[PDB]
Amino acid sequence: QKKKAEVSIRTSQFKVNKLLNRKQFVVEVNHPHWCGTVPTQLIRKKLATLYKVPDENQVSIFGFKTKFGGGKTTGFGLIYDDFASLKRYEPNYRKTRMGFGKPQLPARKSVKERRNRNKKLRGKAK
């Protein structure tokens, strides 16, 4: 116990994308002596602070690869204008990770069997 596990952050290639209303950057987590992996929830709360972003959720963060043999990881992150441009511009899978879902429709097959039986039918029976 030299101290608590200490986790800092550096973003690398930073880009302001005004087309989608987001900022684009590559995130690097410097964490030594963090048992396990740094779960995302913490990276977000750090980034939201370091840029002084007014909300936590405006920061969406996806994909991470640790480094072989020591605590450091690398990943991508986005930062948006407020509540809107997460909802519009983000995939449905990266949304559900935040908790905002659109629940998965019935298993893809089940749609296919119905599509076909309807290739039989005419009028209002279909």
Partner: protein, 164 residues
């Protein structure tokens, strides 16, 4: 199908499977550098042969021929890095004389033993897989890691190891 990912051979088995002259020369190297298998010898025979062979081709060539300068200096650089050769030697003829030990001396297993962090070479080979040796801040688990001569200062031990 449709997956384009290139793979290749690193080694070759010798003709004349068993010659008591070669087998002798083999074991004398296996025990000295702490090697697991003959396979790891035949490997530095091929990376040495390929290297050697392009040295001939470029050497048969006329001086100042554009390949001999550009492609010739690059083989002659990378052997100064990795320290296959001494920075005193630049003729490109020297590349054409190298030996299996030169590339084995440069293998992280021997160097951790030569640098003196280990008893001989068997401690060194286990002590690498045991994840304790780091090259520069980077834990390196592969005994066959070839140690660039700029990196022979930095080895020491890991910071996740017992030793830090």
């Amino acid at each position: 199908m449709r997956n384009y990912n290139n793979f290749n051979r690193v080694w070759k088995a010798p003709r004349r499977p068993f010659e008591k002259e070669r087998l002798d020369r083999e074991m004398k190297l296996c025990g000295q550098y702490g090697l697991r298998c003959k396979r790891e010898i035949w490997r530095v025979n091929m990376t040495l042969s390929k290297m050697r062979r392009t040295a001939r081709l470029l050497l048969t060539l006329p001086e100042n021929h554009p390949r001999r300068l550009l492609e010739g200096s690059a083989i002659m650089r990378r052997c100064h890095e990795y320290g296959f050769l001494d920075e005193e030697k630049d003729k490109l003829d020297y590349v054409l004389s190298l030996t299996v030990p030169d590339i084995l001396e440069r293998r992280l297993q021997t160097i951790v033993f030569k640098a003196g962090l280990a008893k001989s070479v068997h401690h060194a080979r286990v002590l690498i897989q045991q994840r304790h040796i780091a090259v520069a801040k980077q834990i390196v688990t592969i005994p066959s890691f070839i140690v660039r001569v700029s990196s022979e200062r930095h080895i020491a031990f890991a910071d996740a190891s017992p030793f830090g």
